[PDB]
Each structure stands twice: as structure tokens, then as C-alpha cells.
Amino acid sequence: DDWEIPDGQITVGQRIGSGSFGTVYKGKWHGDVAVKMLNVTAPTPQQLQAFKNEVGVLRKTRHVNILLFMGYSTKPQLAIVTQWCEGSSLYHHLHIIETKFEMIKLIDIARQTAQGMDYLHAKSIIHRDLKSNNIFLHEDLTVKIGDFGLATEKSGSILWMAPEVIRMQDKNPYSFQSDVYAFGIVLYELMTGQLPYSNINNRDQIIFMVGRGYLSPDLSKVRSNCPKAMKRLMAECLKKKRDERPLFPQILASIELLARSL
Ligand SMILES: Cc1ccc(NC(=O)c2cccc(C(C)(C)C#N)c2)cc1Nc1ccc2ncn(C)c(=O)c2c1
């Protein structure tokens, strides 16, 4: 396969967001597209390697619930082209404009996320930065999971981090279950319409306490109309001890059960 888009083909439209590791533009390329470019002048050996990593990971994915990769560009600057996403991220909906979703819809959002996560994990891919920000409600109807983060070098958002990741275990604390915990927080987000630890205004303390398990999401905050099976699944995903968490085939199965009888 070869997915390189020759220079000049893409019409770089309006700037969206900029970060340490790339600037995003809306664009034209056989229809609307999103264009993330990872440098302005000198491409660093690191940048060039992380460009290859990101493309490489992205092109392993073909699933409705994951952002559609469409192509990459090297001349004149290292760029990754994906589908354009119409709408808002889940973080934006819940925490900025407070869209009041119904339970049916919330559970469905959770379902579609679990559906995509399932895929990623199945494809030997660990997300490493799941959060309602990287859950895009495309067309308000279909969840697209990507990594829209610009601060990190795709080769931190602390609330979604698992204790063993927030602590420090040798080199690789990241696992499927590290992703699962993040999903747990995301479930918490749907069910409380709120961020965890909203009543603590100190970052360091949160980091420290989550790590030592002195702090945990206050689960008694769930919307009353939320199913009890959901609350229970949420707690499973949020278990402090890493190996006690369910994997995604199991999570998915569980969500689909409570979805059908409602
Ligand atoms: C243009 C682009 C290219 C590549 C990536 N990269 C990833 O999503 C990614 C990078 C590394 C790893 C992964 C995995 C596969 C692990 C996931 N998920 C995904 C993001 C983007 N950003 C991007 C893509 C589409 C967009 N639609 C609408 N709006 C308004 C946006 O701001 C926007 C931003």
C-alpha cells in the first residue's frame, strides 16, 4: 500500500489548533479533510521518527469508531491527513456547553467508545491518552476515537491516568488496563456530567493521592437515572489494582447487556 499525497493537492484552509507537536488545519482534498503538520522548518530526526510511528499506527486502523486516516505528506512539511470531523468532542459537550444527553444516548456514546477501544486493543494498539477530549461526537451520532492532543509527542491529562501510571513503575506502566481505567473515568464523566476531583484545586496533590490510592472518583455522584449495572461496571474499570480490571471484549459485552433492556 502507498498513501502519500503529493504536494499542492491539499488546500490548507482555516487553522484550528496549535501545540508543541503539530498545528491542525481544516482543508480540501477530495472533500473536507483535517491536516496536522508536525513541523515548520527543520524536521528533527525525532520528529521524522515520530511522524513514521504515528502514520504507521494510524494505517493499522479501519473502523467506524476510530478517526479515518486518509494520507500523509512529507513535502513541503511532515503532515498527516485524516477525515474532517463535524461537531464537538465529548469533553466539549459535557463540560463546556453541558449538552444534557439522555441515558439512552449516554450509554450509546459509552458503547461506541468501548467498540473502538476494543478494536484498537485487538489491533495491538494502546491509546495511552484516552479522555473525553479524544472522543469526538462526529455528526453528534458516531463516536470517533483519535488522539487530538498536540502537547504530547505521539511516538499530561492527569485525571484519566491510572494509579500505576501516575506512580512510577520502571519503564512501561501502560497496558490495556491503563486504557481501561481512562475509560472508567470517561464513564464517570458521562454519568456525573462532571470531571473527577472538581473540589480539589491542587494538581500535585491529586497526582500524589491517586497514586497512593488515597483519592478515587466519588462514585456516589452518578445521575440517579443511571443503571445500577453501569455503576458496577464503572467501579470494575476504576479498580486501583491493575490486574483486577476487565478487558475490552468483556466491557463491551457488559455494556451491550444493559443497553438492550431499557
Ligand atoms: C489531523 C490529524 C492527524 C492525525 C491525528 N492523530 C491521531 O488521531 C492519533 C495519533 C497517534 C495515535 C492514535 C491512535 C491510533 C492510538 C488513536 N486513537 C491516533 C490527529 C489529527 N487531528 C485531527 C483530526 C480530525 C479533526 N477533525 C476536526 N477537528 C475540529 C479537529 O481538530 C481534528 C483534528
Q: Which of 86, 72, 14, 1 is nearest to 38 (CA)?
A: 72
Phi, psi at residue 2, to the nearest 5°? Answer: -140, 120
Q: What's the structural domain count of the chain?
A: 2
C-alpha cell at 131: 479522555
Active site residue 243: no
Domain closes at, from 36, 63, 86: 86
Cell numbers 494505517 correspond to: 59
Determination technique for this PDB entry?
A: X-ray
Domain closes at, from 86, 114, 145: 86
129, 174 contact by CB (below 8 A): no
* Cα atoms found within 13 Å of the Cα of residue 96, Cβ hemisphere only: 8
Cell numbers 521518527 correspond to: 49
Q: Name the closest-CA residue to atom 18, ligand 1.
A: 146
Collapsed DSSP state (helix, strand, coil) of residue 143: strand
Using CA atoms, how far residue 162 sits from 132, 166, 208, 217, in Å, is: 15, 6, 12, 12
CB of 217 sitting under 6 A from ligand 1? no
Ligand 1 center–CA 235 separation, angstroms:
29
Burial (CB count <10 Å: 0-12, 13-18, 19+), residue 237: buried
Q: How many helices and strands (H and E) does the chain possess?
A: 8, 8
Same domain, residue pair 139 and 226 = yes
Stretch (H or E) spanning 100: none
Collapsed DSSP state (helix, strand, coil) of residue 27: strand
Torsion of CA 207, 232, 117, 148, to 10 degrees: -40
17, 150 contact by CB (below 8 A): yes
Omega before 45 within 30 of 0, i.e. cis: no
Torsion of CA 179, 183, 184, 185, to 10 degrees: 100
DSSP assignment letter at 113: H
CB of 150 sitting under 6 A from ligand 1? no
Domain closes at, from 86, 118, 137: 86
Same domain, residue pair 74 and 94 = no
DSSP assignment letter at 43: P
Chain breaks in the chain (C to N over 2.5 A) after: 155
Same domain, residue pair 169 and 39 = no
Same domain, residue pair 148 and 43 = no
Same domain, residue pair 209 and 242 = yes
In terms of DSSP bridges, do strands 32-37 and 11-19 run parallel, antiparallel, or are they unpaired? unpaired
Using CA atoms, how far residue 99 sits from 72, 180, 194, 230, in Å, is: 35, 25, 12, 20
Record the resolution, in angstroms: 3.2
C-alpha cell at 112: 461506541
Q: Which of 131, 154, 135, 133 is nearest to 143 (CA)?
A: 135
Same domain, residue pair 64 and 177 = no
Known binding residue 116? Answer is no
- Determine the structural domain holding residue 105 and report its residue range: 87-262
Same domain, residue pair 152 and 186 = yes
Indicate the top mutation candidate among 14, 36, 120 to test ligand 1's pocket, ranked by most ligand atoms within 8 A of CB. 36
CATH code where residue 18 lies: 3.30.200.20
The beta strands (E) that lie in the chain are given as 11-19, 22-28, 32-37, 69-73, 79-83, 87-89, 135-138, 142-145
Q: Which of 118, 129, 147, 179 is catalytic?
A: 129
DSSP assignment letter at 169: -
CB of 16 sitting under 6 A from ligand 1? yes
Collapsed DSSP state (helix, strand, coil) of residue 6: coil
Cell numbers 472508567 correspond to: 184
C-alpha cell at 141: 451520532
> What ligand 1 atom has the least distance to the C-alpha of 36?
1
Burial (CB count <10 Å: 0-12, 13-18, 19+), residue 208: middle
In terms of DSSP bridges, do strands 32-37 and 22-28 run parallel, antiparallel, or are they unpaired? antiparallel
206, 216 contact by CB (below 8 A): no
CB of 219 sitting under 6 A from ligand 1? no
The CA distance from 223 to 188, in Å, is 10
Known binding residue 36? Answer is yes
Strand partners, 72: 4, 80
Known binding residue 125? Answer is no
